Design an enzyme around this catalytic site. Structure first.
Site, mmCIF file in Angstrom:
data_model
loop_
_atom_site.group_PDB
_atom_site.id
_atom_site.type_symbol
_atom_site.label_atom_id
_atom_site.label_comp_id
_atom_site.label_asym_id
_atom_site.label_seq_id
_atom_site.Cartn_x
_atom_site.Cartn_y
_atom_site.Cartn_z
ATOM 1 C CG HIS A 1 -27.198 -26.714 102.294
ATOM 2 N ND1 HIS A 1 -27.183 -28.000 102.818
ATOM 3 C CD2 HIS A 1 -27.854 -26.761 101.163
ATOM 4 C CE1 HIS A 1 -27.458 -28.727 102.088
ATOM 5 N NE2 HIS A 1 -28.415 -28.054 100.904
ATOM 6 C CD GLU B 1 -34.437 -27.378 95.311
ATOM 7 O OE1 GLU B 1 -33.578 -28.338 94.591
ATOM 8 O OE2 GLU B 1 -33.928 -27.088 96.319
ATOM 9 C CD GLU C 1 -28.319 -33.277 99.160
ATOM 10 O OE1 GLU C 1 -27.716 -33.397 98.154
ATOM 11 O OE2 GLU C 1 -28.484 -32.122 99.845
HETATM 12 C C1 LIG Z 1 -28.899 -32.997 95.521
HETATM 13 N N1 LIG Z 1 -30.116 -32.060 95.885
HETATM 14 C C2 LIG Z 1 -29.585 -31.354 96.921
HETATM 15 C C3 LIG Z 1 -30.731 -30.061 97.095
HETATM 16 O O1 LIG Z 1 -31.939 -30.628 97.594
HETATM 17 C C4 LIG Z 1 -30.146 -28.960 98.095
HETATM 18 N N2 LIG Z 1 -31.049 -27.958 98.332
HETATM 19 C C5 LIG Z 1 -30.960 -27.333 99.272
HETATM 20 C C6 LIG Z 1 -31.485 -25.814 99.329
HETATM 21 C C7 LIG Z 1 -30.678 -24.713 99.112
HETATM 22 C C8 LIG Z 1 -29.431 -25.174 98.102
HETATM 23 C C9 LIG Z 1 -28.092 -24.380 98.197
HETATM 24 C C10 LIG Z 1 -27.209 -24.523 97.300
HETATM 25 C C11 LIG Z 1 -27.196 -25.511 96.118
HETATM 26 C C12 LIG Z 1 -28.590 -26.275 96.239
HETATM 27 C C13 LIG Z 1 -29.578 -26.252 97.121
HETATM 28 C C14 LIG Z 1 -30.627 -26.936 97.059
#
Ligand SMILES: CNC[C@@H](O)CN1CCCc2ccccc2C1
Length: 332
Positions: free
Chosen positions: A270, A122, A113
């Site tokens: 999210h 990221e 993911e």
């Molecule tokens: C496993 N990798 C997932 C990551 O790609 C998800 N991301 C989504 C963006 C916002 C967010 C909110 C809370 C926790 C993590 C994240 C980062």
């Protein structure tokens, strides 16, 4: 800076925030289980497993061996979940970065993911593509492709709020101090922030442009610099205040393709959506063409500089902006 990035992923509350996104979790489960022949008795690499949930889905689908790689201290909690779920025989948690760890063998399928805001935030896709050094020939990737969408939007209230905020500095006597010389810098700082939020689809003024990354074919260096030309054919007349961004990914399995969309026509996730303002709005009549380039350049903060040039071809009115996705404004 990368230190901060992995510490964030060591919190169960952050894992919980991702697991409680039912669109995210349920679609990955559908993708894996309804393509059980891509998993039945295969070798799986799970890049950035966090708590390990995707590795359990791959186990539920019949995989015989899953290597779950995780750099944050979340890897210790993932191993506790493998023991307590009596899966030590089939799931091996390997702590570390995918670029550094050793796998004991090549794998049939890579799952991950790695989608940030605007897909690319990221820079996890680089780890994902880098893991292809462990993929057997004719191995698969889950997700298989990613589509970024761009679309022009009108939102006068979002634009105006930037100046309302910076005009705090346009005061000749704040407690007796003249702040006005910093007005322009403050305006500059607010406009460099991508806005994370959702919105009504009626603010969109043209059909979106799509830019596709095929993860089966892309190399890691293909993501250091991402040039997205666009030509929009305006469906509505008004002021364009900037570009809105969202993404889809597809899991192209042997049995079926499952789609995970973050589009504003779809239920919220999210990831929300992302908007980037122009320095100056642009008028376009329905039927005009809005043309330009969105250039993403990877930076030192696990993120991207965003450079957007746009023009109304009928008029010559041009505008631009340079944004930094590391410092987004969470407006939701
Ligand atoms: C496993 N990798 C997932 C990551 O790609 C998800 N991301 C989504 C963006 C916002 C967010 C909110 C809370 C926790 C993590 C994240 C980062």
């Amino acid at each position: 800076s990368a230190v901060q990035y992995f510490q964030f992923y060591g919190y169960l509350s952050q894992q919980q925030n991702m697991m409680q996104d039912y669109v995210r979790t349920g679609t990955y489960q559908r993708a894996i289980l309804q393509n059980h022949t891509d998993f039945k008795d295969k070798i799986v690499l799970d890049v950035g497993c966090g708590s390990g949930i995707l590795s359990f889905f791959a186990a539920q689908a019949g995989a015989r061996k899953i290597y779950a790689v995780e750099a944050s201290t979340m890897a210790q909690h993932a191993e506790v979940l493998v023991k307590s779920n009596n899966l030590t025989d089939r799931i091996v948690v390997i702590p570390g970065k995918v670029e550094e760890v050793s796998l004991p063998e090549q794998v049939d399928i890579i799952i991950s993911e790695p989608m940030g805001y605007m897909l690319f935030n990221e820079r996890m896709l680089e780890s994902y593509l880098h893991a292809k050094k462990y993929l057997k020939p004719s191995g698969n990737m889950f997700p298989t492709i990613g589509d970024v969408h761009l679309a022009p939007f009108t939102d006068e209230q979002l634009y105006m709020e930037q100046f309302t905020k910076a005009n705090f500095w346009y005061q000749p006597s704040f407690h007796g101090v003249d702040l006005s010389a910093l007005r322009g810098a403050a305006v500059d700082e607010y406009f460099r922030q991508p806005v994370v939020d959702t919105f009504d689809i009626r603010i969109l003024m043209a059909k979106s442009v799509k830019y596709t990354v095929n993860f089966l074919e892309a190399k890691e260096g293909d993501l250091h610099r991402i040039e997205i030309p666009f030509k929009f054919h305006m469906l509505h007349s008004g002021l364009v205040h900037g570009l809105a961004f969202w993404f889809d990914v597809a899991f192209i399995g042997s049995i079926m393709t499952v789609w995970l969309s973050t589009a504003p026509t779809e239920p919220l996730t999210h990831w929300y959506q992302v908007r980037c303002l122009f320095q100056s709005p642009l008028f376009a009549k329905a039927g005009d063409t809005l043309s330009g380039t969105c250039l993403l350049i990877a930076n030192k903060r696990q993120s991207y500089d965003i450079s957007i040039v746009a023009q109304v071809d009928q008029t010559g009115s041009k505008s631009s902006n340079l944004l930094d996705l590391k410092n987004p404004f969470f407006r939701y």
